[PDB]
Amino acid sequence: EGSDAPNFVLEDTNGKRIELSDLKGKGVFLNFWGTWCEPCKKEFPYMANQYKHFKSQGVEIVAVNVGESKIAVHNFMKSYGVNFPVVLDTDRQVLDAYDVSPLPTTFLINPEGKVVKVVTGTMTESMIHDYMNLIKPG
C-alpha cells in the first residue's frame, strides 16, 4: 500500500538534523506550512492538542516550514504552543520533492514509510484525529 515517501534531512530551529527514514516504525504526519498562511494558523492548535494523545501511540509530527528563517519559525512556534518537531526547508528542496503547491499540504506516512494519504487545505481537529489513527503502529 502507499507510495514511497522521499527521504530528506532538514534542521530544526536549534540546528538538529532530522531524517525522515529515522522515523520508520512510527506513523508520520508530515505537514508543509508557512507563518503567513491563515489555513495553517487555524490548524496548528489542533495539531498540538492531538499530539498530546498520539505521541504515546507511536505517531510523530514533522512540520516542514517553507523557506522562512529560524527566528520567524521560533516566534510562530512559541505563539501557537508547538510541542512537536518543526524543520526548516530553507531552499524549498523538500517542498519540490513532495510536489507541494498549496499550503497547507499534509502527507500521512505509515510505519513502513509509505505515503498512504494526502490532504490539501486546512484540517479540522476531528479530521486530524482520524488521520493520526490511520497511521499509528500498528
CATH code, domain with 81: 3.40.30.10
CA distance readout (Å), 18 to 23, 58, 70, 112, 121: 9, 17, 15, 18, 25
Q: Which residue has the cell 538534523?
A: 17
What's this structure's resolution in Å?
1.4
Contacts of 38 (CB under 8 A, 6+ apart): none
E strands of 25-103, at which residues?
27-33, 59-66, 86-89
Measured distance CA(93)–CA(91) in Å, rounded = 6
CA dist 18 and 24 (Å) reads 12
| CA dihedral (111, 116, 118, 119) positive or negative | negative
Domain of residue 124: give its range.
1-138
For residue 60, the tally of other CB atoms under 10 A from its CB is 21
Quote the CA–CA distance of 9 and 44 in Å, as a whole number: 23
For residue 3, what is its C-alpha cell? 507510495
Please spell the DSSP secondary structure of 85-123, one letter per residue. -EEEETTSHHHHHTT--SS-EEEEE-TTSEEEEEEES--
C-alpha 22/C-alpha 55 separation (Å) is 16
Give the burial class of 96: count Cβ atoms within 10 A of its Cβ; 0-12 exposed, 13-18 middle, 19 or more buried: exposed
Assign 48 to helix, strand or coil: helix
Phi, psi of 127 (to 5 degrees): -60, -45
Beta bridge partners of 9: 19
Contact 135, 20 (CB under 8 A): no
Residues with Cβ within 8 Å of 16's Cβ and at least 6 positions away in sequence, in order, are none
- Give the method used: X-ray
Q: How many helices (H) and strands (E) does the chain have?
A: 4, 8
Number of domains in the chain: 1
Go through 101-137 and write b for each residue having 16 or more CB atoms within 10 A of its CB, e for each that does not.
eebbbbbbbbbebebbeebeebbeeeebbebbeebee
